[PDB]
Every structure is written in structure tokens, then in C-alpha cells.
């Protein structure tokens, strides 16, 4: 499913992402925009053989099991396919674990390079939240 900007803001807010670990809702929406263009089905292969899945492009090397990333840990305890669902719950719960592991949202390259230090509030401007 391809989310609309406000539709995703609303769903993320409902899932407790607004201000989770100090990161306002605008940060998450911005990250989703640049990581997957709001598409829950996005996948991208990395040079190391691992793959990124879903709206938040979670990696198979550490977070989920896709059956083809040797020696990977399944820290979120879920098949990577669950992260491609129209229901963002699995992606949200796993992201909360990632953002809590010490590096914050810096774990998301697009966030660090395209959202960090920008006016992230603009990503939720106009949405009835």
C-alpha cells in the first residue's frame, strides 16, 4: 500500500511513534518518505547480500529473517515479509527497537542525510492529527 502523507502521519501517531525516544512525528514521516516513498512494499538489495524491507527499509542483516542473509540476527523476531504488509504495526514495533539501540534515527541513512537538521514539522503540516 502506498500511503498518503497525512494518512501515514495519522497511523504512525496511533502506533506511538510521535515523540518516541524524543523524535517528533515529522522525523518518522520524513524518513518513510525518503526510505520507501511511503510504499509498504519497497525492497532494496544491499551489496553485502542483505535486503531492506518496507516503509522504513529495515535490514535483514540484523532485524528480520528473509532466509537468504547468512549469519544474520533476527532481532525483531519476524519474517522480513511481515514488514511489507499494508498494516504498519510490525514495521513500527521493529523500528522502536532499532531507534532504541543507541544510535537513534541515525540508523536510517536517508534520515541522517535528508531529514536530520531540517524543518521536519513541514512533513505533518496540514494534517488533522
Tab-separated table of C-alpha atoms in Angstrom:
chain	number	residue	atom	x	y	z
A	1	UNK	CA	0.000	0.000	0.000
A	2	UNK	CA	1.226	3.490	-0.858
A	3	UNK	CA	0.371	5.857	1.975
A	4	UNK	CA	-0.596	9.480	1.636
A	5	UNK	CA	1.490	11.878	3.762
A	6	UNK	CA	-1.203	12.659	6.404
A	7	UNK	CA	-2.632	9.142	6.315
A	8	UNK	CA	0.795	7.781	7.359
A	9	UNK	CA	1.330	10.556	9.946
A	10	UNK	CA	-2.006	9.544	11.491
A	11	UNK	CA	-1.228	5.810	11.513
A	12	UNK	CA	2.229	6.389	12.998
A	13	UNK	CA	0.816	8.677	15.655
A	14	UNK	CA	-1.704	5.997	16.615
A	15	UNK	CA	1.127	3.479	16.917
A	16	UNK	CA	3.015	5.582	19.464
A	17	UNK	CA	5.727	6.944	17.177
A	18	UNK	CA	5.058	10.613	17.916
A	19	UNK	CA	7.952	11.656	20.202
A	20	UNK	CA	9.199	8.071	20.650
A	21	UNK	CA	12.740	8.468	22.093
A	22	UNK	CA	12.463	12.209	21.550
A	23	UNK	CA	11.782	12.043	17.806
A	24	UNK	CA	8.765	14.074	16.724
A	25	UNK	CA	6.292	12.663	14.182
A	26	UNK	CA	7.764	14.769	11.384
A	27	UNK	CA	11.040	12.810	11.634
A	28	UNK	CA	9.365	9.431	11.026
A	29	UNK	CA	7.243	10.677	8.107
A	30	UNK	CA	10.315	12.297	6.541
A	31	UNK	CA	12.311	9.054	6.978
A	32	UNK	CA	9.492	6.973	5.461
A	33	UNK	CA	9.245	9.375	2.510
A	34	UNK	CA	12.879	9.091	1.610
A	35	UNK	CA	13.351	5.468	2.548
A	36	UNK	CA	10.422	3.976	0.605
A	37	UNK	CA	8.394	6.862	-0.859
A	38	UNK	CA	5.563	5.788	1.527
A	39	UNK	CA	5.332	2.344	-0.149
A	40	UNK	CA	4.976	-0.599	2.241
A	41	UNK	CA	6.165	-2.999	-0.483
A	42	UNK	CA	9.558	-1.412	-1.169
A	43	UNK	CA	12.609	-3.714	-1.060
A	44	UNK	CA	16.233	-2.924	-1.898
A	45	UNK	CA	19.203	-5.268	-2.092
A	46	UNK	CA	22.481	-4.219	-0.485
A	47	UNK	CA	25.985	-5.102	-1.761
A	48	UNK	CA	26.561	-7.319	1.284
A	49	UNK	CA	23.679	-9.574	0.251
A	50	UNK	CA	21.235	-8.263	2.881
A	51	UNK	CA	17.936	-6.614	1.879
A	52	UNK	CA	15.912	-3.653	3.197
A	53	UNK	CA	12.158	-4.083	3.599
A	54	UNK	CA	9.106	-1.918	3.897
A	55	UNK	CA	8.127	1.627	4.600
A	56	UNK	CA	11.127	2.097	6.920
A	57	UNK	CA	13.552	-0.106	4.925
A	58	UNK	CA	14.507	-2.394	7.817
A	59	UNK	CA	17.595	-4.541	7.129
A	60	UNK	CA	17.733	-8.379	7.077
A	61	UNK	CA	21.313	-8.473	8.433
A	62	UNK	CA	20.124	-7.642	11.968
A	63	UNK	CA	16.386	-7.175	12.261
A	64	UNK	CA	14.368	-9.734	10.349
A	65	UNK	CA	14.764	-13.162	8.776
A	66	UNK	CA	14.438	-13.491	4.989
A	67	UNK	CA	16.080	-16.895	4.663
A	68	UNK	CA	18.887	-15.665	2.426
A	69	UNK	CA	21.126	-13.445	4.593
A	70	UNK	CA	23.755	-15.843	6.105
A	71	UNK	CA	24.727	-15.214	9.726
A	72	UNK	CA	22.105	-12.550	10.207
A	73	UNK	CA	20.410	-11.992	13.550
A	74	UNK	CA	16.613	-11.720	13.694
A	75	UNK	CA	16.443	-9.088	16.456
A	76	UNK	CA	12.798	-8.178	15.775
A	77	UNK	CA	11.826	-11.880	15.567
A	78	UNK	CA	9.783	-11.665	12.388
A	79	UNK	CA	9.984	-12.824	8.768
A	80	UNK	CA	11.028	-9.818	6.649
A	81	UNK	CA	7.797	-10.319	4.645
A	82	UNK	CA	5.727	-9.123	7.629
A	83	UNK	CA	7.355	-5.717	7.094
A	84	UNK	CA	5.752	-5.356	3.640
A	85	UNK	CA	2.158	-5.551	4.926
A	86	UNK	CA	-0.493	-2.845	4.474
A	87	UNK	CA	-0.619	-2.879	8.271
A	88	UNK	CA	2.409	-0.957	9.538
A	89	UNK	CA	2.358	-2.486	13.011
A	90	UNK	CA	5.283	-4.884	12.519
A	91	UNK	CA	7.367	-2.139	10.914
A	92	UNK	CA	6.549	0.244	13.757
A	93	UNK	CA	7.336	-2.204	16.576
A	94	UNK	CA	10.642	-3.157	14.956
A	95	UNK	CA	11.598	0.492	14.308
A	96	UNK	CA	11.047	1.235	18.037
A	97	UNK	CA	13.642	-1.424	18.842
A	98	UNK	CA	16.112	-0.076	16.220
A	99	UNK	CA	15.825	3.556	17.345
A	100	UNK	CA	16.349	2.427	20.963
A	101	UNK	CA	19.626	0.563	20.310
A	102	UNK	CA	21.946	3.533	20.863
A	103	UNK	CA	22.338	5.347	17.518
A	104	UNK	CA	18.860	6.804	17.408
A	105	UNK	CA	17.435	7.593	13.978
A	106	UNK	CA	20.963	7.766	12.568
A	107	UNK	CA	20.344	4.060	11.855
A	108	UNK	CA	18.353	5.288	8.813
A	109	UNK	CA	20.788	6.703	6.213
A	110	UNK	CA	18.106	8.711	4.396
A	111	UNK	CA	17.006	10.265	7.706
A	112	UNK	CA	20.554	11.280	8.560
A	113	UNK	CA	21.183	12.660	5.088
A	114	UNK	CA	17.839	14.213	4.210
A	115	UNK	CA	15.802	14.872	7.355
A	116	UNK	CA	18.248	15.456	10.184
A	117	UNK	CA	18.598	19.169	10.883
A	118	UNK	CA	15.770	20.215	8.537
A	119	UNK	CA	12.326	21.534	9.420
A	120	UNK	CA	10.665	18.141	9.878
A	121	UNK	CA	7.429	19.750	11.133
A	122	UNK	CA	6.695	20.535	7.489
A	123	UNK	CA	6.017	16.827	6.900
A	124	UNK	CA	2.885	16.955	9.091
A	125	UNK	CA	1.725	20.484	8.121
A	126	UNK	CA	-1.977	20.450	7.230
A	127	UNK	CA	-2.823	17.017	8.628
A	128	UNK	CA	-5.726	16.650	11.014
A	129	UNK	CA	-3.982	14.839	13.863
